[PDB]
Design a protein around this ligand. Structure first.
Ligand SMILES: Nc1ccn([C@@H]2O[C@H](COP(=O)(O)CP(=O)(O)OP(=O)(O)O)[C@@H](O)[C@H]2O)c(=O)n1
Lengths: 95, 690, 58, 110, 60, 57, 257
DNA sequence: CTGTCCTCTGGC
DNA sequence: GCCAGAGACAGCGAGTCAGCAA
RNA sequence: UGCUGACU
């Protein structure tokens, strides 16, 4: 017998989102869709890059504006390394 | 700055000035910055460090009759000196002018408020009077603080004095900065007398000297055994105990044996003797009986319970935590951080063993730091407070073991029964100089800790607050290699100022511009800034191969793995922050980046020290002209011109403040020392003090 | 030419003999060759090596 | 060099988060057989507890558990932030979402 | 299922050394697979080419 | 010291500031010339070596 | 320890000495090797020896002798060390291979190199249970202290061409080891009268004690000479006569009393 | 910190 | 019985002046 | 006796 994870009494299972068709497995497996993992400093404001052209290879300095102050962010793009975080998505197939 | 307004050529029209005898409005400020390391250390030791010391102080629970009693020390406070009790009249204060006339100690009152409980629902806060602790002269707990030179003359004082000393029986003991290995940094060493520690030990090992908040120090050695296995030696109460690694790693972290392994093979994931010897550490001694964190803690608890002297009603799992808290990596609060630090020290023994790294000389100032008067004072205070608790409750358990219900009537009559202790023990360390402690305080020396400061001249006196003693044990050695004047003490120790007989090379003196760090800062927003700069947290996704990455450390805590092409820019950015006082980088953080090549050079990685006992020295930062402060280890990877026209474009990152910065204070009083032979400037330094 | 153990002054762990000198510098000045005399004194780096020698002597 | 136009469609209230998992003992060659269940704390009034989550993964042989709180919560979840970018190759537009990283670990009880 | 040859690869702990044909189920969670691995672990390694060698060092 | 004799001393001291590369190179038995950075690397290797008798050379 | 025998001053002796110097220097397996290639319980090993261009010049070695050495000494000291570890752990190619595996039960087959030691490997296997680690460590710590052949006690010779101005024609075959009898075979190449050594215990065993007295005296004199000091010979005579009083070279220390 | 003892111990 | 493993074990310049604490 | 300075 596998001791089956037992959920603590103060926790409840979160249902899937049927109102989420975006992170749906179907949407993510589309031939024109690519998934990217992004790591940033804790104080990084992603909105500062809105409309700006982030690189898909190499290293580039990208300028962002936050609260009126100009910030410049070095962006490094790479080939996924074996062992990287896997994205979980709701699947109708998985009940 | 602090070296501006330095005279360009001497003058003689200051004597023969109409104001020669008028006592000045404020004290000199250049003479004050000589004993500054002796006073700013004590100021912490007695106010901000004493609270932290008492905060550790595990509550002393023990058994009375069929009852268990808990005693905790909530606060301890040292008061300025004062007339004993009120039995005296007309002036409560007590100024150092007396106790030199009379022959007595300038001692303040140390009192704490203990809190005794019976199971935690019955409690009362009593305020016991612990004893008397000596006081430094201008130390915030002294009566001559904040006095101008004119008011310092009506009390019979020098009008130009900087105390930095103690008056133990009116003798002015001058406890001097001893040399310690380092703090919170793993030093890889090749010492051949280590293979005698056991059957298969080798002459390789990384030592770490751990200090927590300046109240506790501990020495832990990771040894390499010929099998490829690593052992851990810890010392508790002057006894050496050997625990295979794996017992320690499994206890500290509730992780799988593959995740512990994936960590100790981070940079050498192609090597196969290592991959095989990591497994022989995890399986050979741990799959033999204990495979869950608790069973490891339980086994470790049973073997060590007898010599850790733990409470009898303590589960073995609780006695294991006691060993890890009090003996291994004192500096780190977390057990997860303590795991990552033991893993980087091992990853380093594997590189020293495979000849991929150079042994760190313990005798280079790169791998050395100083022990100030406040670290010795607090580290003795804390130990004596723990001893006081133990003795009061020895008396408790021994008196009657009798129905504490009504015995709450004599509880104070009980605590006072052993509160008669803390005074004379403290004066021995100061009047005699030698140390009587159950744990030697992670020191390695037990004598010559405090010395008489004699005012034969003002050049004998000023040299007691700038002396640095390599150690008192090295005065007895066949080989003379701790007497070599290596080129790494450039600007930090004077070449000429050394005693010229039996103490030669062992008693050095700081240059005029050198200084000890003594401030304590937050250093909490630094780990979150390093990540903005380009570091990737120890948790994962390095973005490269763990071999083309630098292991980032910050005061014993491994932030982790700045990329190899981002390490230079990160070091330069951090150096620009400290120089321009941006972010919260302390003006004195040492950003070190030991580059990595294929050669057996010192182990690579970006360190960042900000601890309170390193030596620093000013240098004019070129490209910014902003008077940076560099440390003993940070100075080996940078070019520092002396004269201008020696500055170049790519070379000469920095520049020195004055050309004679290298020489001590006394060696700067010898005229034209450049045209005399050197053994004669060493005799002049010793003759100007007689 | 300064000589400590029958050899030139030792190098640091980074390959420089003194904080003033580039790492692995070929000039004889960086190895303790003092061209100054006591008539017209010796510069700081040469002072350092001379002190190293005079101290090993004792 | 290939580039993408950055857009943070992100989370409407920031209540929405994606879910990243990392296994402490390596990769799963084909995890297609894993069932993940996300658990949240019932206490929505305590700001400290309202963000506590447990991720459980069940296999035929073993269970994995990851949490964003307590010892199992690791430093990377805060010092750094994680995002997921969804790139439309045709439009060159990258949509960026907040992500939560769970470090997964095996399940056994005495 | 890509931890290599010394760890359970579905549980976590490390396995023991080989004696009977079946993968030596660990003291915890004794599930077994791959009694004897397909290929014996083969290792490609050699020495250095400056000191041990008089070859590779004619000039340079 | 006489002047007109310190000029020769000064010129000899100026000449002495160019004799490091040749010395070290011709002691490592390196190609007689064309290497100006292989010599620094060979010196570094000889310095971090274990035997340390190609450094004393 | 050292020696110094003059060279006999004859045309034949001068020619034979070149070979003599090249004959007494130690050649060790490690001094003749390029790099090993170890594969691993079936542990193979290919030695890949150096070409003769740059080591036969001053070592007097040949490849058949060198390889024969591996078959008879290294490949069995290897099993000796494997047992050292495993005791406390818990047409013509054919005859050579056959005799070699006649003597050991682990090896299978090596190789042959009919062209200047092209590829010369070996294969072993301990099939039941052995500690499979990077055994290259053992076969490298052993391929250093493994010496092809050396005169016992002599580590290297050298002919310091000139030692005299008066009769400049003198040649000396100095050595950095000490084996007196292993030079007695060259009484026609070298002058065995005029043989000198700084050992004083070896002289006292090949020539007697009255010959060690003078070596003691000359050693003290040459020690003082390097500093210009000059103690009178009448003092060293008494010291050497007292030290060698009772037939043996006795130390002047706590065990001599 | 080195060199002889020198008294085991241990393996052979 | 032959000779490594150690593991104790003993040695470590001459003279002189103070003070201070136990 | 001890220990900390110092002299040739
Ligand atoms: N520890 C010691 C120190 C000294 N002495 C004795 O004092 C003499 C002069 O010492 P010194 O140091 O003045 C040498 P000196 O040649 O006179 O110096 P100079 O070059 O400046 O002229 C030495 O030669 C010894 O006889 C001793 O027995 N034990």
């Amino acid at each position: 017998d596998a001791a089956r994870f037992s959920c603590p009494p103060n926790f409840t299972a979160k249902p899937p989102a049927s109102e989420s068709p975006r992170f749906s497995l179907e949407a993510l497996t589309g031939p024109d869709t690519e998934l990217w993992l992004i790591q940033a400093p804790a104080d990084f404001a992603p909105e500062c890059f809105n409309g700006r052209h982030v690189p898909l290879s190499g290293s580039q300095i990208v300028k962002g504006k936050l609260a009126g102050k100009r910030h410049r962010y070095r962006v490094l793009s790479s080939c996924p390394q074996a062992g990287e975080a896997t994205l979980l998505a709701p699947s109708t197939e998985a009940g | 700055s602090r070296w501006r307004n330095l005279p360009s050529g001497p003058s003689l029209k200051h004597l023969t000035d109409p104001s020669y005898g008028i006592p000045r409005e404020q004290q000199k400020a250049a003479l004050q910055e000589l004993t500054r390391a002796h006073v700013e250390s004590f100021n912490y030791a007695v106010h901000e460090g004493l609270g932290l010391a008492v905060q550790a102080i595990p509550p002393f629970e023990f058994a009375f009759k069929d009852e268990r009693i808990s005693f905790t020390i909530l606060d301890a406070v040292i008061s300025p000196p004062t007339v004993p009790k009120g039995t005296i009249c007309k002036e409560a204060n007590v100024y150092p002018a007396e106790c030199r006339g009379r022959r007595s100690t300038y001692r303040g009152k140390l009192t704490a408020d203990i809190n005794w409980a019976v199971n935690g629902i019955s409690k009362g806060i009593i305020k016991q009077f612990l004893g008397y602790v000596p006081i430094m002269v201008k130390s915030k707990l002294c009566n001559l603080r904040n006095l101008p030179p004119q008011a310092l003359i009506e009390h019979h004082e020098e009008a130009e004095e900087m105390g930095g000393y103690f008056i133990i029986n009116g003798i002015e003991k001058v406890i001097r900065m001893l040399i310690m290995p380092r703090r919170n940094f793993p030093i890889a060493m090749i010492r051949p007398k280590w293979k005698t520690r056991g059957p298969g030990y080798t002459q390789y090992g990384v030592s770490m000297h751990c200090v927590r908040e300046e109240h506790s120090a501990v020495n832990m050695n990771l040894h390499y055994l010929e099998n490829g296995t690593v052992m851990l030696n810890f010392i508790y109460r002057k006894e050496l105990f050997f625990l295979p690694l794996g017992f320690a790693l499994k206890a500290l972290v509730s992780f799988s044996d593959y995740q512990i392994f994936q960590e100790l093979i981070k940079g050498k994931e192609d090597d196969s003797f290592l991959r095989n010897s990591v497994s022989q550490m995890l399986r050979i001694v741990m799959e033999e009986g204990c495979s869950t964190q608790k069973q490891v803690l339980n086994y470790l608890g049973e073997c060590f319970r007898v010599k850790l002297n733990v409470p009898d009603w303590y589960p073995n799992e609780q006695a294991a935590e006691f060993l890890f808290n009090q003996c291994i990596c004192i500096h780190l609060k977390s057990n997860t951080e303590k795991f990552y630090m033991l893993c980087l020290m091992t990853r380093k023994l594997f590189a020293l063993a495979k000849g991929e790294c150079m042994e760190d000389n313990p005798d280079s100032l790169v791998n050395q730091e100083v022990l100030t008067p406040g670290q010795l004072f607090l580290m003795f205070l804390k130990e004596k407070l723990e001893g006081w608790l133990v003795s009061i409750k020895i008396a408790f358990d021994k008196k009657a073991q009798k129905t504490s219900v009504s015995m709450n009537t004599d509880n104070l009559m009980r605590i006072f029964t052993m509160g008669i202790d803390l005074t004379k023990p403290f004066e021995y360390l100061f009047a005699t100089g030698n140390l009587r402690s159950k744990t030697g305080l992670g020191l390695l020396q037990d004598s010559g800790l405090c010395v008489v400061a004699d005012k034969l001249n003002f050049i004998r006196y000023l040299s007691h607050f700038r002396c640095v003693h390599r150690g008192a044990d090295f005065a007895k050695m066949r080989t003379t290699t701790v007497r070599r004047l290596l080129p790494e003490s450039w600007g930090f120790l004077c070449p000429v100022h050394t005693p010229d007989g039996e103490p030669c090379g062992l008693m050095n003196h700081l240059t005029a511009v050198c200084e000890v760090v003594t401030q304590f800062v937050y250093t909490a927003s630094i780990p979150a800034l390093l990540c903005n700069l380009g570091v990737t947290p120890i948790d994962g996704a390095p973005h490269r191969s763990y071999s083309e990455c630098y292991p980032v450390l910050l005061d014993g805590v491994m932030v982790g793995w700045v990329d190899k092409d981002l390490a230079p820019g990160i070091a330069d950015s951090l150096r620009h922050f400290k120089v321009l006082r941006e972010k919260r980088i302390p003006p004195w953080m040492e950003v070190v980046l030991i580059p990595m090549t294929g050669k057996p050079s010192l182990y690579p990685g970006l360190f960042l020290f900000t601890t309170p006992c390193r030596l620093v020295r000013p240098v004019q930062n070129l490209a910014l002209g902003k008077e940076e402060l560099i440390g003993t280890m940070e100075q080996i990877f940078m070019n520092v011109a002396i004269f201008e026209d020696e500055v170049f474009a790519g070379v000469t990152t920095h520049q020195e403040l004055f050309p004679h910065s290298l020489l001590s204070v006394i060696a700067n009083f010898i005229p034209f020392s450049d045209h005399n032979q050197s053994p004669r400037n060493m005799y002049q330094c010793q003759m100007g003090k007689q | 030419q300064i000589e400590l153990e029958g050899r030139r002054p030792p190098l640091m762990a980074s390959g420089k003999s003194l904080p003033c000198f580039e790492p692995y510098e070929f000039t004889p000045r960086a190895g303790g060759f003092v061209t100054g005399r006591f008539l017209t004194g010796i510069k700081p780096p040469e002072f350092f090596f001379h002190c190293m020698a005079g101290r090993e002597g004792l | 060099l290939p580039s993408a136009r950055w857009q943070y469609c992100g989370a409407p209230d920031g209540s929405q988060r994606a879910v990243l998992v990392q296994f402490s003992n390596g990769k799963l060659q084909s995890p297609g057989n894993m069932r993940f269940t996300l658990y949240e704390n019932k206490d929505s009034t305590n700001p400290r507890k309202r963000n506590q989550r447990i991720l459980a993964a069940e296999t035929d042989r073993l269970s994995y558990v990851g949490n964003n709180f307590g010892t199992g919560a690791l430093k990377c979840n805060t010092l750094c932030r994680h995002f997921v970018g969804i790139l439309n190759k045709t439009s060159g537009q990258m949509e960026v979402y907040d992500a939560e990283l769970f470090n997964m670990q095996p399940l056994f009880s005495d | 299922a890509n931890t290599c040859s010394s760890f359970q690869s579905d549980l976590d702990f490390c396995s023991d050394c080989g004696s009977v044909l079946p993968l030596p189920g660990a003291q915890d969670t004794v599930t077994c697979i791959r009694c004897g691995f397909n290929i014996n672990v083969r290792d490609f390694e050699g020495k250095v080419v400056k000191t041990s060698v008089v070859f590779h060092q004619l000039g340079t | 010291v006489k002047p007109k004799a310190d000029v020769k001393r000064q010129r000899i001291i100026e000449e002495s500031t160019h004799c490091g590369p040749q010395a070290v190179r011709a002691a490592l038995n390196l190609p007689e010339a064309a290497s100006y950075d292989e010599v620094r690397g060979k010196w570094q290797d000889a310095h971090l070596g274990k035997d340390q008798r190609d450094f004393n050379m | 320890p050292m020696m110094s025998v003059p060279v006999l001053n004859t045309k034949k002796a001068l020619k034979r000495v070149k070979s003599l110097k090249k004959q007494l220097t130690r050649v060790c397996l490690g001094e003749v090797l390029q790099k090993i290639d170890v594969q691993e319980q079936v542990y193979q090993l290919r030695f890949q020896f150096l070409p003769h261009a740059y080591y036969q010049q001053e070592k007097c070695l040949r490849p058949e002798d060198i390889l024969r050495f591996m078959e008879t000494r290294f490949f069995k000291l290897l099993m000796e060390s494997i047992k050292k570890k495993n005791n406390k752990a818990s047409e013509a190619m054919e005859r050579r291979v056959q005799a070699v595996r006649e003597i050991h039960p682990f090896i299978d087959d090596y190789q042959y190199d009919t062209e200047e030691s092209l590829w010369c490997q070996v294969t072993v296997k301990l099939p039941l249970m052995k500690i499979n680690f990077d055994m290259s460590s053992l076969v490298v710590s052993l391929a250093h202290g493994a010496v092809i052949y050396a005169t016992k006690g002599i580590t290297r010779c050298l002919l310091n061409e000139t030692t005299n101005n008066k009769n400049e024609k003198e040649l000396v075959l100095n050595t950095e080891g000490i084996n007196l009898p292993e030079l007695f075979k060259y009484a026609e190449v070298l002058d065995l009268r005029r043989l000198y050594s700084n050992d004083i215990h070896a002289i006292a065993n090949t020539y007697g004690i009255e010959a060690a007295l003078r070596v003691i005296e000359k050693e003290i004199k040459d020690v003082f000479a390097v500093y210009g000091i000059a103690v009178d010979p009448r003092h060293l005579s008494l010291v050497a006569d007292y030290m060698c009083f009772e037939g043996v070279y006795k130390p002047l220390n706590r065990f001599g009393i």
